[PDB]
Amino acid sequence: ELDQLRQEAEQLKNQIRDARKACADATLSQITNNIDPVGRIQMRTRRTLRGHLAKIYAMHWGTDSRLLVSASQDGKLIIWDSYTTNKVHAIPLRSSWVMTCAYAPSGNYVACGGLDNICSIYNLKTREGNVRVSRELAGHTGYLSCCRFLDDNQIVTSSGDTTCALWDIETGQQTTTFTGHTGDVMSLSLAPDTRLFVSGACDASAKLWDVREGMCRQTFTGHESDINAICFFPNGNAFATGSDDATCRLFDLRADQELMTYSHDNIICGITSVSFSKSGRLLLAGYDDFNCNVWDALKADRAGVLAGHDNRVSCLGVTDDGMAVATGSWDSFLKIWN
Amino acid sequence: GCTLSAEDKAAVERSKMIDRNLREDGEKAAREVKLLLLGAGESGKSTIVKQMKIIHETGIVETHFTFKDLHFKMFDVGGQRSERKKWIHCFEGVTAIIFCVALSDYDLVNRMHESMKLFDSICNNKWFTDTSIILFLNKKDLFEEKIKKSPLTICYPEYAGSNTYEEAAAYIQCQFEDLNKRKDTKEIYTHFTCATDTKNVQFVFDAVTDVIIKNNLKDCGLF
Amino acid sequence: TASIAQARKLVEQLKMEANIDRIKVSKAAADLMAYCEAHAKEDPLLTPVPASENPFR
Amino acid sequence: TLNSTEIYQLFEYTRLGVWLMCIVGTFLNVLVITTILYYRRKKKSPSDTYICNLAVADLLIVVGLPFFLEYAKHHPKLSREVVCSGLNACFYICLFAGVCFLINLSMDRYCVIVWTCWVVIFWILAVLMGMPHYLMYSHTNNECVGEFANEGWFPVFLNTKVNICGYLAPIALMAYTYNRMVRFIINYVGKWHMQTLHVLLVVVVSFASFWFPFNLALFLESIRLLAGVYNDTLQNVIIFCLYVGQFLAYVRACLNPGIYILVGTQMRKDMWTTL
Amino acid sequence: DVQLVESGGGLVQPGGSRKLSCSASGFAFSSFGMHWVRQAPEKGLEWVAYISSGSGTIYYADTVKGRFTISRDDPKNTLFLQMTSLRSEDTAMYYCVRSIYYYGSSPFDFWGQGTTLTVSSSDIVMTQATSSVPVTPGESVSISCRSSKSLLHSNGNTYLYWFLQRPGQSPQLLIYRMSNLASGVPDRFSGSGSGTAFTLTISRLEAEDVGVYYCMQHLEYPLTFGAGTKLEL
């Protein structure tokens, strides 16, 4: 009956909790107590990109570490050349309510989506000389939160109907759907070798999914409300999350536990975005208090602040070679720090 | 720019033309009036959009129309079953809110209390501290027919007025206005929807004008 | 019937998630620390590069 | 000062610590310019740009008055024909500049309530308007701040033209606009007590009060020169009128930003935070 | 598909005037810059005129200043050349070329068809060895083109372009900026070389690769071509 199944789930939860606790002899801090501190991180602003006329909601770096794309609520996608602050393309959208954007790893296509429950794929290289819509992918029943290219023919999306999906851009049909969350999925992150990915949702839990067969492998809890951002460590064996309780967290795949908590007593606002450095030593996080903090990821110390925006910082990214950091904000500006 | 090459100058000229087109498009799109349409399930939103769709030009639904050389756009988000707290901050900065309530629900499952809860949630929000609300009370005739048999006291235990339209409608209107807690900043406009054509859109037009004028006067006096 | 199927599916998921192999926290911490130590020289943001090879002058 | 010109001498000898007034006035002007210009033009409002330009005018006056005279202090061989030419221009040009921007400021409010190419055009117009008197004919045709030609068409016309198109036009074009605005606002909102509307009132009151005696002097001077010699009343009245006048115009140019901080709530606070 | 068709050529009395037109169809005309390039009856190519996108920049060759005028009409998708005081040295064949400039683009990618005009009775120098070398199908060949002034800019790019003209056709882009392979070109063509010394390498030479090869520089106006080297069986 139902009651025996609830008791069975309680016994399985107790078994998981005891098996996790039985292999936690030492802390990450005790191990990294003898490391020298990083010191002080002082980053200046090198470029300022202007031309948006409303709030900026997403951005993504190109894989050549020079070009990038930005999305805003005035109904434009803009492609920027960060070295000279020139505009390469400007794409008008059919819907002004856009919440995410992505850049293909090859450079040929660009993806977009928002409150219209549709993911749009745009072709950047054509004989006619203008950017045109290549495909529209429909089938989600809630707003689209994030999207990431795996290839020129495969894309992974997450939505506020508590599901994720994997698409086939040639055909336009879902090949696999990932279910199990009980809240709106808000963020998503691909592994470096592109065989697994993580998803963070509004039930205050994160899940590890396997791309080849749509099954969940591990579930990580510990937050208190509404994980908003997630990212992989460069090694591919750990990840970090950021939520509304003004706290970042570091989770480890192989030990299936929690390693460190990045919280301060003077910070009481939520976190919008999170990212790592190139070597995985610094953790950068954006907040609602118009700032951006830089944390020593191994000693859990505050190392720096980026304080050049006038409204909420909504998006944040680091280049592939690790030469610069880009931040976007609701005051309609993008800045490059180095 | 004296060290640039021949191709760099043409790239800069292309970027300047892109800037010009962006500025002209923003100047053109800054002359719109944006309204957010809300309600509690089946209230009569379809009737309002049908009887205001004077001209013609799931996800989200759009409607563009003109009335006395003034353009309006009305967004409807009744198909979003996800969490409202995660996408409502996209709609701050709209000109006004159109809230639709049906008067025939005072004895149905009441269902009026759900409308009261939604109005209290949206009127005292942290993003709509200054956005004006236009309130439509649809289904007047069916309320007239139903009140003659089912007394209003089934909805309000504290009611003590007469069982007739003129008193009960004013009592409902006051039990909906008396939920604002910022009577110094915003305002509530009430209109009992009538089947006669043009009247409803006229009321919207008058309200949006007298809201724009008070905004221009409130702000430009800052110094 | 729907609730029983949901409960059985949740029990099967938890039974599948409780049979993986776990390592100690100290070993995983030492592996993160070693990866951070090895790649220190190739991180521009940790150790600022001279202005002669900074593309954002 | 100069024996040949023999004007402004009695006040000029009795100048004591007027450099302190120049310092306390330039500090105000530069403070206002910094506060307006360092905060993204205070949300990039355009009407604020005009007020900042008005400060650029007032400072000119102080810079003109000691410096050239101080040069005469060091070099006492100067001739009346040249030094006056240099001095006069500054004074007159600033007057026109202020007037123009004041008028512009009024429009920037009026068009809102009832419904930098412009800046460059206005500055060019202001510079042009002063063409006849800034430096021509030297001493004979242009008074050194007060009186001239002790013993024809060009002075007579010049004086009346400035007296007419430099005083009456602002005092009417601002009083009428203020009347219409303050009468219109009441009907729609009734917000009579508004911070902005006081600024234009205090500005117009100051502009009418302070510039009055000097224009009175130039008026009666042109009238008496046209009509009768009247070497008694003419001399006494002109002497009395030009004396106090210059002092008033000086001090008003020095302290004009003072009303901005005393009355303007937002600008006072912004200026304290900026400092 | 992409098409550029020219008209307005014929026999002209010397000292007269004429107008040539170039109508495009198949692409976004208003986003491209346009060039007019002419070819003498038995010689190589020489650049003539250039009009920008948005008509904000116009350049002319050193020999047609004060005589020729270039213009465009965007709504009808037309490019015009007005020619006055026709000297006998203007007898040629005129081509209409499109080019677009942004980060990563490929200028000079589509060439027109050509119209024939028959008038009756500090520059950078690019050098090539013009002797028609013999080839056989299967082997590999190299082609050289040395410049007088270094084509390497300070931003890392080297501005050299390679074109191929098969017998009785219009030129075709092969290599742009000394290394990049054009779209639709088989991977048998390679381009390399340092400043003032460049090489084009063809491996496994087929039977459709006979023709004339030209090298062009795009460092600074006026644009200059090479004499052109011929491959024949």
mmCIF file of C-alpha atoms in Angstrom, chain A residues 68-296:
data_model
loop_
_atom_site.group_PDB
_atom_site.id
_atom_site.type_symbol
_atom_site.label_atom_id
_atom_site.label_comp_id
_atom_site.label_asym_id
_atom_site.label_seq_id
_atom_site.Cartn_x
_atom_site.Cartn_y
_atom_site.Cartn_z
ATOM 1 C CA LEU A 68 30.138 37.661 -27.679
ATOM 2 C CA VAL A 69 26.345 37.869 -27.839
ATOM 3 C CA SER A 70 23.949 39.761 -25.573
ATOM 4 C CA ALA A 71 20.167 39.672 -25.155
ATOM 5 C CA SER A 72 17.939 42.415 -23.765
ATOM 6 C CA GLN A 73 14.271 43.294 -23.354
ATOM 7 C CA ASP A 74 14.154 45.910 -26.110
ATOM 8 C CA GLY A 75 13.913 43.047 -28.603
ATOM 9 C CA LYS A 76 17.485 42.786 -29.861
ATOM 10 C CA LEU A 77 20.330 40.298 -29.963
ATOM 11 C CA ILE A 78 23.648 42.087 -30.418
ATOM 12 C CA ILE A 79 26.965 40.495 -31.383
ATOM 13 C CA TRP A 80 29.966 42.448 -30.098
ATOM 14 C CA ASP A 81 33.679 42.488 -30.895
ATOM 15 C CA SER A 82 35.194 43.059 -27.465
ATOM 16 C CA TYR A 83 38.633 44.167 -28.693
ATOM 17 C CA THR A 84 37.309 47.194 -30.608
ATOM 18 C CA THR A 85 33.733 47.557 -29.229
ATOM 19 C CA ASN A 86 32.278 47.273 -32.734
ATOM 20 C CA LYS A 87 28.886 45.741 -33.470
ATOM 21 C CA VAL A 88 28.973 42.871 -35.953
ATOM 22 C CA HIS A 89 25.286 41.911 -36.059
ATOM 23 C CA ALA A 90 22.004 43.110 -34.571
ATOM 24 C CA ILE A 91 19.084 40.675 -34.800
ATOM 25 C CA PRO A 92 15.480 41.768 -34.134
ATOM 26 C CA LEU A 93 13.343 39.228 -32.298
ATOM 27 C CA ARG A 94 9.706 38.308 -32.862
ATOM 28 C CA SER A 95 9.062 38.351 -29.092
ATOM 29 C CA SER A 96 10.490 40.955 -26.736
ATOM 30 C CA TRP A 97 10.305 38.750 -23.610
ATOM 31 C CA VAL A 98 13.674 36.989 -23.740
ATOM 32 C CA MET A 99 15.410 35.321 -20.802
ATOM 33 C CA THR A 100 18.390 33.436 -22.261
ATOM 34 C CA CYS A 101 20.867 33.235 -25.131
ATOM 35 C CA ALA A 102 23.635 30.918 -26.286
ATOM 36 C CA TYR A 103 26.531 30.787 -28.743
ATOM 37 C CA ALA A 104 27.416 27.748 -30.831
ATOM 38 C CA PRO A 105 30.857 26.217 -30.159
ATOM 39 C CA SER A 106 31.607 26.373 -33.900
ATOM 40 C CA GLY A 107 30.358 29.938 -34.385
ATOM 41 C CA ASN A 108 27.717 29.321 -37.053
ATOM 42 C CA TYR A 109 24.466 29.551 -35.065
ATOM 43 C CA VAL A 110 22.901 31.383 -32.120
ATOM 44 C CA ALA A 111 19.998 30.369 -29.867
ATOM 45 C CA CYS A 112 17.387 32.413 -28.033
ATOM 46 C CA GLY A 113 14.285 31.959 -25.904
ATOM 47 C CA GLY A 114 12.018 33.347 -23.234
ATOM 48 C CA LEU A 115 8.376 33.729 -22.165
ATOM 49 C CA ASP A 116 7.047 32.417 -25.500
ATOM 50 C CA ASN A 117 7.971 28.790 -24.613
ATOM 51 C CA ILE A 118 9.942 28.520 -27.877
ATOM 52 C CA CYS A 119 13.652 28.148 -28.637
ATOM 53 C CA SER A 120 14.820 29.964 -31.771
ATOM 54 C CA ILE A 121 17.925 29.020 -33.769
ATOM 55 C CA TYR A 122 19.519 31.670 -36.016
ATOM 56 C CA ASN A 123 21.980 31.121 -38.873
ATOM 57 C CA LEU A 124 24.869 33.597 -38.963
ATOM 58 C CA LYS A 125 26.629 32.544 -42.208
ATOM 59 C CA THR A 126 24.534 32.604 -45.380
ATOM 60 C CA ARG A 127 24.950 33.580 -49.020
ATOM 61 C CA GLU A 128 22.393 36.399 -48.848
ATOM 62 C CA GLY A 129 24.369 38.326 -46.231
ATOM 63 C CA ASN A 130 21.738 38.722 -43.498
ATOM 64 C CA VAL A 131 20.893 36.776 -40.354
ATOM 65 C CA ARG A 132 17.683 34.764 -40.650
ATOM 66 C CA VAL A 133 15.755 32.351 -38.454
ATOM 67 C CA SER A 134 16.779 28.757 -39.078
ATOM 68 C CA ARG A 135 14.357 26.942 -36.781
ATOM 69 C CA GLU A 136 11.803 27.313 -33.988
ATOM 70 C CA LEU A 137 11.576 24.484 -31.442
ATOM 71 C CA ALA A 138 8.267 24.139 -29.591
ATOM 72 C CA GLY A 139 6.996 21.646 -27.038
ATOM 73 C CA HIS A 140 7.698 23.115 -23.619
ATOM 74 C CA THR A 141 4.679 24.185 -21.565
ATOM 75 C CA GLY A 142 6.475 26.826 -19.488
ATOM 76 C CA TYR A 143 8.957 29.624 -20.019
ATOM 77 C CA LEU A 144 12.445 28.697 -21.189
ATOM 78 C CA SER A 145 15.193 29.219 -18.608
ATOM 79 C CA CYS A 146 18.502 28.181 -20.188
ATOM 80 C CA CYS A 147 19.903 26.531 -23.299
ATOM 81 C CA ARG A 148 23.330 25.215 -24.293
ATOM 82 C CA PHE A 149 24.653 23.841 -27.575
ATOM 83 C CA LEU A 150 26.249 20.402 -27.616
ATOM 84 C CA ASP A 151 26.969 20.451 -31.355
ATOM 85 C CA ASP A 152 25.668 22.057 -34.531
ATOM 86 C CA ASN A 153 22.739 19.610 -34.420
ATOM 87 C CA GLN A 154 21.974 19.013 -30.719
ATOM 88 C CA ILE A 155 20.841 21.410 -27.999
ATOM 89 C CA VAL A 156 19.760 21.010 -24.366
ATOM 90 C CA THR A 157 17.004 23.179 -22.895
ATOM 91 C CA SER A 158 15.420 23.580 -19.466
ATOM 92 C CA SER A 159 12.054 25.092 -18.675
ATOM 93 C CA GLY A 160 9.746 26.232 -15.900
ATOM 94 C CA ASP A 161 7.462 23.241 -16.395
ATOM 95 C CA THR A 162 9.899 21.235 -14.216
ATOM 96 C CA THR A 163 11.505 19.441 -17.184
ATOM 97 C CA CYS A 164 14.598 19.465 -19.362
ATOM 98 C CA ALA A 165 14.896 18.211 -22.924
ATOM 99 C CA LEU A 166 17.362 17.311 -25.671
ATOM 100 C CA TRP A 167 16.506 18.405 -29.203
ATOM 101 C CA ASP A 168 17.453 17.423 -32.747
ATOM 102 C CA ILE A 169 17.749 20.649 -34.728
ATOM 103 C CA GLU A 170 17.666 18.846 -38.086
ATOM 104 C CA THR A 171 14.300 17.222 -37.312
ATOM 105 C CA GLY A 172 12.932 19.513 -34.603
ATOM 106 C CA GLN A 173 11.763 16.665 -32.357
ATOM 107 C CA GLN A 174 12.719 15.881 -28.773
ATOM 108 C CA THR A 175 14.843 12.755 -28.486
ATOM 109 C CA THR A 176 15.021 12.595 -24.680
ATOM 110 C CA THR A 177 13.155 14.325 -21.860
ATOM 111 C CA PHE A 178 14.489 14.602 -18.308
ATOM 112 C CA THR A 179 11.897 14.621 -15.514
ATOM 113 C CA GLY A 180 12.023 14.437 -11.734
ATOM 114 C CA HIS A 181 12.231 17.977 -10.400
ATOM 115 C CA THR A 182 9.243 19.296 -8.457
ATOM 116 C CA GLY A 183 9.961 22.980 -9.092
ATOM 117 C CA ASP A 184 10.815 25.331 -11.915
ATOM 118 C CA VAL A 185 14.236 24.482 -13.325
ATOM 119 C CA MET A 186 16.240 27.703 -13.339
ATOM 120 C CA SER A 187 19.798 26.844 -14.364
ATOM 121 C CA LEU A 188 21.819 24.269 -16.253
ATOM 122 C CA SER A 189 25.466 23.446 -16.912
ATOM 123 C CA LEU A 190 27.243 21.107 -19.340
ATOM 124 C CA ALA A 191 30.259 18.979 -18.477
ATOM 125 C CA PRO A 192 33.578 19.711 -20.232
ATOM 126 C CA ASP A 193 33.555 16.344 -22.040
ATOM 127 C CA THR A 194 29.790 16.635 -22.722
ATOM 128 C CA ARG A 195 28.473 13.350 -21.366
ATOM 129 C CA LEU A 196 26.699 14.566 -18.197
ATOM 130 C CA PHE A 197 25.136 17.808 -17.057
ATOM 131 C CA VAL A 198 23.704 19.380 -13.918
ATOM 132 C CA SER A 199 20.446 21.219 -13.361
ATOM 133 C CA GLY A 200 19.336 23.516 -10.556
ATOM 134 C CA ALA A 201 15.671 24.125 -9.760
ATOM 135 C CA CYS A 202 13.304 25.868 -7.340
ATOM 136 C CA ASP A 203 12.852 22.861 -5.044
ATOM 137 C CA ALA A 204 16.280 23.698 -3.545
ATOM 138 C CA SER A 205 18.006 20.666 -5.045
ATOM 139 C CA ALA A 206 20.393 19.964 -7.902
ATOM 140 C CA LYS A 207 20.496 16.888 -10.100
ATOM 141 C CA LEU A 208 23.104 15.141 -12.235
ATOM 142 C CA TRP A 209 21.735 13.871 -15.553
ATOM 143 C CA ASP A 210 23.251 11.497 -18.104
ATOM 144 C CA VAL A 211 22.799 12.576 -21.718
ATOM 145 C CA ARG A 212 22.884 9.185 -23.452
ATOM 146 C CA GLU A 213 20.012 7.671 -21.442
ATOM 147 C CA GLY A 214 17.572 9.942 -19.659
ATOM 148 C CA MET A 215 18.178 8.855 -16.072
ATOM 149 C CA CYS A 216 19.183 10.748 -12.946
ATOM 150 C CA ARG A 217 22.318 9.558 -11.182
ATOM 151 C CA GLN A 218 22.746 11.773 -8.101
ATOM 152 C CA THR A 219 20.784 14.425 -6.211
ATOM 153 C CA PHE A 220 22.342 17.118 -4.017
ATOM 154 C CA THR A 221 20.542 19.055 -1.278
ATOM 155 C CA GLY A 222 21.649 21.576 1.312
ATOM 156 C CA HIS A 223 20.381 24.951 0.154
ATOM 157 C CA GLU A 224 17.288 26.635 1.565
ATOM 158 C CA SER A 225 15.527 28.262 -1.408
ATOM 159 C CA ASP A 226 15.527 28.553 -5.189
ATOM 160 C CA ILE A 227 18.920 27.728 -6.663
ATOM 161 C CA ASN A 228 19.458 30.326 -9.386
ATOM 162 C CA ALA A 229 22.917 29.579 -10.797
ATOM 163 C CA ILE A 230 25.158 26.555 -11.316
ATOM 164 C CA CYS A 231 28.558 25.856 -12.869
ATOM 165 C CA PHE A 232 31.193 23.123 -13.233
ATOM 166 C CA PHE A 233 34.676 23.117 -11.811
ATOM 167 C CA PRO A 234 37.181 22.970 -14.706
ATOM 168 C CA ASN A 235 38.214 19.448 -13.690
ATOM 169 C CA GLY A 236 34.698 18.105 -14.198
ATOM 170 C CA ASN A 237 34.478 16.397 -10.791
ATOM 171 C CA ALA A 238 32.758 19.135 -8.761
ATOM 172 C CA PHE A 239 30.351 22.012 -9.219
ATOM 173 C CA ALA A 240 29.152 25.168 -7.486
ATOM 174 C CA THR A 241 25.677 26.599 -6.957
ATOM 175 C CA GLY A 242 24.200 29.936 -5.961
ATOM 176 C CA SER A 243 20.766 30.623 -4.514
ATOM 177 C CA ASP A 244 18.434 33.164 -2.885
ATOM 178 C CA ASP A 245 19.682 32.650 0.683
ATOM 179 C CA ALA A 246 22.806 34.750 -0.043
ATOM 180 C CA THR A 247 25.167 31.785 -0.112
ATOM 181 C CA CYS A 248 27.200 29.828 -2.650
ATOM 182 C CA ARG A 249 27.989 26.156 -2.190
ATOM 183 C CA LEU A 250 30.524 23.641 -3.518
ATOM 184 C CA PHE A 251 29.425 20.053 -4.202
ATOM 185 C CA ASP A 252 31.674 17.099 -5.028
ATOM 186 C CA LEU A 253 30.544 14.346 -7.398
ATOM 187 C CA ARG A 254 32.770 11.479 -6.261
ATOM 188 C CA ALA A 255 32.124 11.900 -2.524
ATOM 189 C CA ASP A 256 28.463 12.896 -3.085
ATOM 190 C CA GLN A 257 28.510 15.532 -0.350
ATOM 191 C CA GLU A 258 29.159 19.195 0.442
ATOM 192 C CA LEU A 259 32.659 20.637 0.723
ATOM 193 C CA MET A 260 32.422 24.378 1.387
ATOM 194 C CA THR A 261 29.918 27.190 1.966
ATOM 195 C CA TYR A 262 30.619 30.730 0.730
ATOM 196 C CA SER A 263 28.589 33.088 2.930
ATOM 197 C CA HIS A 264 29.279 36.411 4.630
ATOM 198 C CA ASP A 265 27.480 38.145 7.480
ATOM 199 C CA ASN A 266 27.021 41.445 5.603
ATOM 200 C CA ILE A 267 25.386 39.922 2.496
ATOM 201 C CA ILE A 268 21.627 39.369 2.663
ATOM 202 C CA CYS A 269 20.639 39.540 -1.015
ATOM 203 C CA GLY A 270 20.217 36.759 -3.538
ATOM 204 C CA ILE A 271 22.736 35.560 -6.105
ATOM 205 C CA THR A 272 22.017 35.789 -9.828
ATOM 206 C CA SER A 273 25.038 34.177 -11.502
ATOM 207 C CA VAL A 274 28.161 32.178 -10.693
ATOM 208 C CA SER A 275 31.370 31.283 -12.525
ATOM 209 C CA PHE A 276 34.881 29.936 -11.971
ATOM 210 C CA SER A 277 38.339 31.103 -12.990
ATOM 211 C CA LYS A 278 40.451 29.227 -15.542
ATOM 212 C CA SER A 279 42.407 27.188 -12.985
ATOM 213 C CA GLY A 280 39.467 26.816 -10.598
ATOM 214 C CA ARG A 281 40.997 28.917 -7.816
ATOM 215 C CA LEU A 282 38.673 31.942 -7.777
ATOM 216 C CA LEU A 283 34.880 31.856 -7.686
ATOM 217 C CA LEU A 284 33.028 34.901 -9.018
ATOM 218 C CA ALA A 285 29.429 35.584 -8.028
ATOM 219 C CA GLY A 286 26.969 38.358 -8.871
ATOM 220 C CA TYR A 287 24.450 39.741 -6.391
ATOM 221 C CA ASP A 288 21.366 41.956 -6.273
ATOM 222 C CA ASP A 289 23.215 44.652 -4.291
ATOM 223 C CA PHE A 290 24.736 45.849 -7.624
ATOM 224 C CA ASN A 291 28.139 44.271 -6.850
ATOM 225 C CA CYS A 292 30.151 41.175 -7.731
ATOM 226 C CA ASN A 293 32.372 39.277 -5.311
ATOM 227 C CA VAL A 294 35.512 37.222 -5.914
ATOM 228 C CA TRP A 295 36.079 34.359 -3.455
ATOM 229 C CA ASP A 296 39.123 32.212 -2.777
#
